[PDB]
Design a protein around this ligand. Structure first.
Ligand SMILES: NC(=O)c1ccccc1C(=O)O
Length: 159
């Protein structure tokens, strides 16, 4: 695994929009989106967010993330974390989170990163825990079927 990163580009959109594999996966990384995901929905998110970044290995875009909140001197909130199915479990999310932490520090002078994770996403909860994120609160959300879910709000200091 030899990873690099760069800002997302329009030519990346179809690849990245292909990463969520079902309605649940889309919900866990973009709960406002509607299944099926699309390039137009992804581009609309990018336009209203900051710091949209891809991770690349062996000439392939394998991961994407951005910030859905950003407050200079204060914090950023990581969003839209998506990884190519074949590249799951291989450190791509871990790598991108590190890159986004540096970007929050550098671009926003952030002292904290916030990550919100839906309760069903065990893999995310475990990874964010390995990376030093701590749970702070639990908020109620509703999934696309109107079922109540729990959004675990985590954070981590950035010095
Ligand atoms: N902004 C959110 O409500 C959210 C919550 C959990 C995971 C991802 C996101 C996201 O849209 O990026």
């Amino acid at each position: 695994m030899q990873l690099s990163h760069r800002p997302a580009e329009t030519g990346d959109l179809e690849t990245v929009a292909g990463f969520p594999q079902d309605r649940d996966e889309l919900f866990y990384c973009y709960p406002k989106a509607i299944w099926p995901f699309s390039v137009a929905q992804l581009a609309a998110a990018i336009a209203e967010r900051r710091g949209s970044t891809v991770a690349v290995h062996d000439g392939q875009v394998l991961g994407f993330a951005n910030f859905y909140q950003w407050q200079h001197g204060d914090f950023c909130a990581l969003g839209n974390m998506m990884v190519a199915p074949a590249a799951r479990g291989l450190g791509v999310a871990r790598y991108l989170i590190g890159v986004m932490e540096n970007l929050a520090r550098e671009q926003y002078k952030a002292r904290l990163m916030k990550i919100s994770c839906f309760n069903a996403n065990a893999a995310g909860l475990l990874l964010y825990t390995q990376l030093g994120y701590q749970p702070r609160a639990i908020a109620e959300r509703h999934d696309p079927d109107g079922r109540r879910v729990a959004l675990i709000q985590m954070d981590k200091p950035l010095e």
